[PDB]
């Protein structure tokens with residue numbers, strides 16, 4: 480019914496942790512640069528909580544914020560209130576990026592075609608998690624080691640998966 | 645259609661720069677040693693402009709120069725004029741190395757199975773670039789930090805990717 484590619488863009492740790500105290504648990508600017516490169520020119524779909532922590536519209540991409548608040552407005556951003564409204568807004572898009580956080584990852588989980596997932600080899604203290612996924616009918620199409628140096632203090636890998644059927 | 649493994653051998657910077665003023669933009673003897681080690685005993689496929697800058701046949705390898713010049717000859721070197729002519733000359737080879745530069749990298753890009761790519765963590769002035777690549781269905785099978793010392797003044801990593809399908 481929807482015809483834009485639904486992609487998940489996420490970074491998580493050994494226990495699926497993605498967030499702590501309404502923020503990121505880790506500082507990895509190189510991972511952020513990979514994120515910016517991959518998502519450039521494509522809509523970003525983010526939950527209200529995810530967006531507000533970010534604070535600003537992210538440049539070179541349609542910023543779409545998901546909230547139940549029927550009177551929510553932010554300048555230079557579009558607002559959706561459901562999965563379907565997002566699909567309407569993105570009717571003609573090539574590929575959209577579900578950008579988090581957990582509640583929004585849950586929301587769109589039945590619709591994911593492609594998963595860009597960064598795996599961090601460390602056990603962080605956290606309160607927000609990426610939901611479990613049945614990977615049957617999923618094929619790993621890409622994997623590479625992330626940059627570990629003095630500015631990026633963890634070991635991590637970029638993985639990309641595509642759904643077969 | 646062809647049966648030899650087609651490998652790319654390339655060193656590039658943060659912006660895909662591979663050349664400046666028909667030469668290399670950096671001096672990195674250690675990276676040269678890695679190159680000589682990995683390519684030894686295998687054919688080198690070089691664009692005419694790449695070859696002439698080098699100046700001499702490289703020992704222990706078949707040197708194959710790619711040119712449109714139907715009357716071009718160099719002693720101790722073989723001359724091809726097309727992708728297919730290279731494939732003919734290399735029909736029995738296990739693995740051939742596409743050695744550059746840009747025009748020759750473009751030429752063979754549809755056929756690459758393996759990528760040996762050094763990434764240099766510096767932004768050089770340059771005029772020649774390694775083409776963009778869709779890494780879908782490629783997996784990184786090797787990564788290691790290059791030697792940084794007084795004789796090799798940059799930060800760089802050796803990467804190897806293999807095509808899955």
Ligand SMILES: NC(=O)C1=CN([C@@H]2O[C@H](COP(=O)(O)OP(=O)(O)OC[C@H]3O[C@@H](n4cnc5c(N)ncnc54)[C@H](OP(=O)(O)O)[C@@H]3O)[C@@H](O)[C@H]2O)C=CC1
Pocket residue numbers: 488489490491496497498499500501502503525526527528529530532545546547548559560561562578579580581582583584586607
């Ligand atoms: N490391 C990573 O890859 C990522 C981590 N994060 C982290 O995750 C955390 C944020 O995630 P989380 O707390 O789950 O919050 P979310 O980003 O998922 O936002 C939650 C909000 O989304 C809206 N919402 C949820 N469901 C619906 C629905 N069905 N219909 C309409 N609107 C809905 C609600 O907005 P409202 O209340 O206004 O109605 C809700 O409060 C932070 O810690 C953040 O840093 C976020 C993205 C990526």
Ligand SMILES: NC(=O)C1=CN([C@@H]2O[C@H](COP(=O)(O)OP(=O)(O)OC[C@H]3O[C@@H](n4cnc5c(N)ncnc54)[C@H](OP(=O)(O)O)[C@@H]3O)[C@@H](O)[C@H]2O)C=CC1
Pocket residue numbers: 653654655656661662663664665666667668690691692693694695697710711712713724725726727743744745746747748749751772
């Ligand atoms: N850092 C690295 O990994 C590498 C960098 N380099 C750098 O790259 C630069 C050179 O690259 P570039 O300028 O692209 O030159 P090339 O090495 O690609 O040589 C170009 C020549 O190849 C021949 N050629 C191109 N297309 C075809 C074709 N379709 N059929 C037959 N022959 C063809 C032509 O020769 P003709 O004119 O005779 O007809 C053309 O002039 C230099 O600066 C060099 O130092 C080179 C290799 C590796």
Ligand SMILES: CCc1nc(N)nc(N)c1C#CCc1cc(OC)c(OC)c(OC)c1
Pocket residue numbers: 488489490502503510511514529532533537577578579595596597
């Ligand atoms: C951890 C990164 C990240 N990586 C990947 N692979 N996917 C994602 N979806 C996100 C994400 C996210 C949320 C996010 C992004 C940000 O920069 C744009 C933030 O600003 C610094 C931010 O501050 C609170 C929060």
Ligand SMILES: CCc1nc(N)nc(N)c1C#CCc1cc(OC)c(OC)c(OC)c1
Pocket residue numbers: 653654655666667668675676679694697698742743744760761762
């Ligand atoms: C930068 C090295 C290099 N590294 C990698 N990883 N791949 C490559 N394909 C090349 C290359 C190249 C071209 C090249 C080679 C040379 O020595 C053999 C050169 O002599 C000093 C040279 O001078 C004009 C030019």
